[PDB]
């Protein structure tokens, strides 16, 4: 990639130690700008949730495969779940989001819980199939903890068809009392629910489809056991995309499996990491992979960098592989270390091909996990490492592996008070890397490979502007 | 040593500015490579303990001697406790830990004091040879502080003779509502105890055995006074490694102290320190030294680089050394600036034959101090430096001396609330130095120094990951 | 009733002012005094529950009548609830405690919530009549909080027959791991939990029971609206006792419902108040009233001395109050005010023929409310007034009455850590008034009466002894 004349640092660089300089643009406005992916997993913005168990369920899948972004589905996962979720996503509607259904015999404390398993804000209470009504943090609060859903107060909501565009919906909901509004099937049973900043979002996003028009998902593998088996059981479990994951993307196991992979002849592309070296990027190509991940140690739960003194700095890592498979003809998906929209612009700008995100959305309300309360009343969750699952592998024998393998990390993810869901920090993600392609001046993601140019900045540097 | 490419960083680096890159590895699982040294010290794991008094004791000596690394102890000490420790070494089980002896005349407070001079956690009571109860924090807690050790409800033990496998042993554990099991001897009279991760550990690490197949240990002596005489006694006291500690390894003394040991033929490995240049290393060498420890400065408890000016970045004294040492056949040891496993794994990378640990084994179980308890309640201990001990050399004089002599500086070292003995931090260590071994794709340490590539990383390159 | 020489002090004398002066005894032991009241209530324990919907609930009803005392259900509650929870309590073991049924679809939420409505620590998990499992506080919490309750580790229970004494269950739960035990039908269908404190309090307290043997049971009614088609329906429901409540009961309105309930003829005993002077108490018995309440104003919930100024001391009030009622023939209950188990004691001396919480029993596991956490995670319940439910009574008439109303009264009551449920409340009260009974050497209340002496003492006098 271009570099700043007299810009040859002795050590690899990060995020935070690259610029970027903007150059002459012709781009108008961020919408100008289209975020579709080349590695062909055909998401429609550069971001890819990571195959963390913390934080790849099905409700981020479904939200951000209709954000137009492609979820991973966690490795080690019994193949009943994975089918159940990979059918509850790809029955999902491409502009209406799945709501929280509460059946009427519900509890008080069941419905105030699921109230924040998804950003609406609200909980529809649904009757043999037909919506009856909406509880929401008001209602809910005060009442009794164990008292029926049924006696909860429902509020009245705003029902409109499934099929009418979201001007429409928008303009209904200006002056509604509650946010959300109730798509309904023509039959008048309950479809789905649609907020104002989802009517907003409808027409900037563009969901990231299959060839049937269903909502994209992608599942993960490991090297332990039998890897071609469990590869063809889910690529007839309809996962689209499929990602081999492992500690080391180098070692003799990891090219075993992907030539296994390669030979099953699934027709999927093939995700492969992780390495952090060109040699490595090209053992991956040769091995039967498409698509590349790069990253080992950056992640925000990773701790080899900590224990083994193994990695190397994201950015640097990023573009030679980048340079490596763009040579042999494949891509490269940056994973680990992003925790600011900068860091999404900089690995596509450093020449991956994509990047995705892990931890980072692990505090979000669609995170699979429990959204616990700190002493502060600060929404957060937890975000775990998937040890084990992305290393290679009787009492004695379990406990005796068990002593020398890493710990599972965990890690305190503030949720944000206002803009708690992933929809806004997609939107956040989204909105920095169109700026940073307005002042590269690119109208595409090869454009912006094409056109950036970096500059090195010091620890002083990264000082300037507002945190 | 092997670096990146346009790494040519125009300033000495430490442990936090390196990182090492991943290659392409054959090495299937961690347990698949062996941690021996090939400096003749004969210990099968890379870790040393530093010859400080406050970490170098009788307890620490044996138990890393059965995990496999040597103990150093420290100088200055009357070779009457030299042989006494020495002896109770070479008489130590090879796999058994020696428990917590308690008679049954001693009071609750000397049980209680004692109970955490070990990891094992519990205190086995015996009386005339025999094991006859346990105590631990639950039975001892709540009764008068000097009642008898008789009276404090002694529990029941899981007993077996020695010479079962530890697999049956485990077993046996596996439902045993005290962790330690009391190895006894044919004849019925107490021989250890093992705990369920001692059973565990006992397969994993092969112990640092001497020509007989006993304990190996080390002692250290310094240069004031007559070195030689006290050199050959202590290799008369049994000790297997002598180890001649110095603040300043370059000075005359230093060359004449290696000459004298040298000349006196005693057959014990030669270690001599501390120098962090290349000539430094080949006069010790040509000293008649087979090993050379390298580090002044970045010593936790040293205090010279603040006082002086004095020292260098461990990292780069280190591989350079080290690439002397190997030009002249010698070996190296790494000494100071460890408090995590990748400064292990980076001394062993950059070329050391060994590392030594020093204060950070301090904050143990059983060092050889005093666990004092904070006001929040966190154990802890007191880590010195060596000071006058690693210094060269009437009430007036010894004052006058005194006065310009750096004072004795003293640290808290933390104990780990859970994983507070040192066989955990041995673990920590040894996983570390096994996943960097699987990382850069090595079957051993000369492999590891061989096929091991660094970069440079600035210092938002260490922010990466999980701390 | 007897006083000391010379203690005739100018003001009324409430529990803090006044104390029992032990005489000669002959009762051996606490165990060999009845509390069974005379007032033909029929609660062989002198311990009342108030009818206050903070206080009084379906659990408290069937745990106080099983331990031998009246529950008055609250006023002003829908006749339907009011017949499903005498059904509930009528359908009862007098052994056993009906404990948290939870159905296997339970979430792990509902079942955490539910864990804290019985003070048995633990929750049956009961498929098709049959128990399959038992959960609690530990195996609980980690998991997920919307897991299925199917899926949360179920522990084994210890399962007895019907019928067993409970000296057999109590040796079974010897050294049981969980201290509950499922008392099962014979028909294998699951009848209820019996505790180990439980089995002990079996024998201690005789449960209170009607004619046909059924835990006895209490409600209360108004004086606004028809008086007597209310306390007809409530007769019909199958309550035991009939308690006509008000702030004020020496009103006309009081007078004229007791009247017509006393002409209704329906054979339970006739409770009213609250009259805190003789003459109020000689009207309420005239009016056909065969138990008084005393005290308005003593209550912890009670605002009305602030705000009024009206009230009165409750010992003087309940000794003169007695007095009269004796002279009449009556019986009198005292009410409110009652915080330590002296006050109970004392009330009894004063001659009142039965004492009522209150709002103290509301800091219960078992009484009807929501067990919310403070910041120090001290358990805790809020306890609220009757206000207006005890008070004589368009959207305009509404708020204009209520503008006027006192407010409803919140206080915390905080659960006792170890000894929470309102079984060890009883079982201090009973402690106390047992051994207030021996101190004075009465065999039983009748003689506690007859043979107690009372003297004054100043505030200085209260301070002595441990709080
Ligand atoms: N009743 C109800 N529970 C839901 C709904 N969505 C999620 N849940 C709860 O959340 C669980 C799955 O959590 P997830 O893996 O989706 O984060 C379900 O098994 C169920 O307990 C909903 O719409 N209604
Ligand atoms: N070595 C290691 N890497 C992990 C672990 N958990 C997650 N990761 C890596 O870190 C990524 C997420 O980090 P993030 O992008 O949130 O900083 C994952 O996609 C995976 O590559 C773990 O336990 N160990
Ligand atoms: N009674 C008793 N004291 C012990 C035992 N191990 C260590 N100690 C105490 O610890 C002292 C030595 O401490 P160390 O140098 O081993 O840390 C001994 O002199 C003795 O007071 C044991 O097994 N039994
Ligand atoms: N100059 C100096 N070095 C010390 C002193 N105490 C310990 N050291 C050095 O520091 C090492 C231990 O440091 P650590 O490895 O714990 O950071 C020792 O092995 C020794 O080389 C002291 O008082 N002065
Ligand atoms: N599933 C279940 N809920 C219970 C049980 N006991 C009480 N509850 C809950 O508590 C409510 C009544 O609370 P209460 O008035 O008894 O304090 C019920 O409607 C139900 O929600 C039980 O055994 N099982
Ligand atoms: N005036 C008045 N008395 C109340 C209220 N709530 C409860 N009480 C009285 O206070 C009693 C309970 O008080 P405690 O016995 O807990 O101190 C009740 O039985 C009733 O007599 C209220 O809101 N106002």
């Given at each position: 990639v271009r570099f700043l004349?007299?810009?040859?640092?002795?050590y690899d660089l990060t995020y935070n130690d690259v610029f970027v300089v903007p150059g002459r643009?012709?781009?108008?406005?961020?919408?100008?700008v289209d975020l579709s992916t080349?590695?062909?997993?055909?998401?429609?913005?550069?971001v890819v949730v990571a195959n963390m168990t913390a934080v790849a369920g099905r409700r981020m899948a479904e939200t951000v495969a209709r954000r137009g972004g492609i979820v991973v589905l966690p490795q080690d996962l019994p193949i009943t779940a994975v089918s159940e979720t990979v059918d509850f996503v790809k029955s999902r509607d491409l502009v209406v989001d799945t709501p929280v259904t509460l059946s009427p015999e519900d509890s008080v404390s069941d419905a105030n819980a699921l109230?924040?398993?998804?950003?609406?804000?609200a909980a529809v209470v649904v009757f043999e199939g037909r919506p009856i009504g909406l509880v929401t943090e008001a209602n809910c609060a005060?009442?009794?903890?164990?008292?029926?859903?049924?006696?909860?107060?429902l509020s009245d909501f705003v029902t409109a068809p499934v099929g009418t565009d979201p001007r429409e919906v928008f303009d209904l909901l200006?002056?509604?009392?509650?946010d959300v509004a109730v798509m309904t099937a023509?039959?008048?049973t309950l479809a789905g629910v649609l907020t104002r900043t989802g009517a907003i979002r409808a027409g900037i996003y563009t969901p990231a489809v299959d060839a049937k028009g269903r909502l994209r998902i992608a599942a993960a593998v490991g090297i332990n056991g039998d890897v071609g088996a469990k590869a063809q059981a889910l690529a007839e479990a309809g996962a689209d995309l499929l990602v081999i994951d492992t500690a080391?993307?180098?070692?003799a196991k990891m090219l075993d499996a992907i030539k296994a992979v390669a030979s099953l002849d699934l027709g999927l592309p093939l995700v492969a990491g992780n390495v952090v070296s060109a040699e490595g990027t090209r053992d991956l190509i040769e091995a039967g992979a498409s698509i590349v991940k790069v990253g080992v140690?950056?992640?925000?739960?990773?701790?080899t960098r900590m224990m083994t003194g193994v990695g190397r700095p994201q950015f640097s890592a990023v573009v030679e592989c980048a340079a490596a498979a763009r040579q042999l003809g494949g891509h490269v998906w940056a994973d680990g270390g992003?925790?600011?929209p900068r860091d999404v612009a900089l690995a596509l700008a450093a020449g991956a091909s994509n990047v995705m995100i892990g931890?980072?959305?692990?505090?979000?309300?669609?995170?699979?996990?429990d959204l616990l309360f700190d002493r502060d009343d600060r929404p957060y969750k937890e975000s775990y490492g998937m040890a084990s699952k992305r290393a290679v592998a009787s009492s004695f024998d379990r406990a005796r592996k068990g002593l020398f393998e890493e710990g599972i990390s965990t890690s305190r993810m503030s949720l944000d008070?206002?803009?708690?869901?992933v929809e806004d920090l997609l939107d956040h993600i989204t909105s920095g890397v169109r700026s940073t392609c307005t002042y590269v001046g690119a109208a595409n993601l090869p454009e912006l490979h094409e056109k950036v140019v970096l500059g090195v900045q010091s620890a002083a540097g990264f000082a300037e502007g507002h945190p």
């Open positions: 004349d007299g810009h040859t640092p002795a643009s012709d781009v108008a406005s961020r919408f100008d080349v590695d062909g997993s055909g998401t429609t913005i550069p109230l924040h398993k998804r950003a609406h804000g005060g009442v009794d903890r164990f008292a029926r859903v049924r006696d909860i107060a200006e002056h509604a009392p509650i023509p039959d008048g080391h993307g180098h070692q140690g950056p992640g925000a739960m990773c701790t992003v925790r600011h931890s980072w959305f692990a505090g979000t309300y669609e995170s699979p996990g008070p206002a803009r708690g869901g």
